[PDB]
């Protein structure tokens, strides 16, 4: 039971017409891991300022339904951008760019009569969280009709940390895996692939092959 402020429990019970906006904040797919750029977007007709962040409008079109059972499963969500922005298109279709572990946070904001955000979440004194996870997938669907109206939809795929259910994370008893050996120029040198930077000079599993 996610507790809700009693102040919000009055607005959600007295008012019938609720003006709701979903504030999306996704990390930009970047070629390298340097820095952390964020695109802030909203489903509302006007931009919404939250914690000093301007969530610009005019791009997001629809958001899917977040479902959770009592059996462990990936929590899939799908939000769609317009696809005719031509500035979001290039970010998705860029060459040599990976978004394997880029996150996304979506808030559920309720607007008041004066245009502000009704506080709901007690800990933050702000809006609730709709979904926070990782970006695993994506796509764009062009449909050029030779007579009529065509449509294009960019859909981003989202899920939680367990998206790759066929993933074996373990320390196999071997020197090459323990120190993250990789050929750099002409020698197998330890790299940052080790789970810790202090594993680079650990020769504990050196003689494990002939033991």
């Amino acid at each position: 039971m996610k507790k809700i402020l009693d102040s919000a429990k009055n607005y959600l019970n007295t008012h019938d017409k609720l003006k709701t906006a979903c504030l999306i904040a996704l990390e930009l797919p970047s070629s390298s891991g340097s820095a952390a750029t964020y695109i802030y977007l909203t489903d509302y007709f006007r931009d919404v300022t939250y914690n000093g962040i301007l969530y610009r409008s005019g791009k997001v079109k629809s958001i899917s339904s977040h479902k959770q059972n009592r059996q462990l499963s990936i929590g899939s969500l799908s939000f769609t951008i317009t696809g005719t922005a031509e500035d979001e298109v290039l970010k998705l279709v860029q060459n040599g760019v990976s978004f394997l572990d880029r996150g996304i946070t979506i808030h559920q904001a309720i607007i008041n009569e004066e245009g502000n955000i009704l506080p709901v979440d007690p800990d933050t004194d702000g809006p609730l969280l709709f979904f926070r996870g990782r970006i695993t997938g994506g796509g764009i669907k062009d449909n050029v009709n030779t007579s009529g109206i065509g449509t294009s939809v960019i859909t981003w795929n989202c899920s939680n940390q367990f998206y790759d259910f066929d993933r074996v994370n373990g320390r196999y008893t071997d020197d090459a895996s323990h120190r993250g050996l990789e050929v750099v120029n002409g020698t197998l040198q330890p790299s940052n692939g080790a789970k810790r930077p202090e594993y680079q000079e650990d020769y504990g599993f050196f003689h494990s092959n002939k033991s």
């Binding site: 059972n69 059996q71 462990l72 899939s76 259910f165």
Partner: protein, 35 residues
């Protein structure tokens, strides 16, 4: 009814739609080649 013929003309879509609900959990249909 005449739904059988249709489904027989769109089988791959059925396979994909099935495998899309099994991937919710860790199950997948590519685990039948073993058996």
């Amino acid at each position: 009814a005449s739904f059988r013929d249709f489904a027989s003309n769109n089988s791959t879509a059925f396979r994909d739609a099935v495998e899309l609900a099994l991937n919710e959990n860790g199950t997948t249909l590519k685990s039948l080649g073993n058996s």
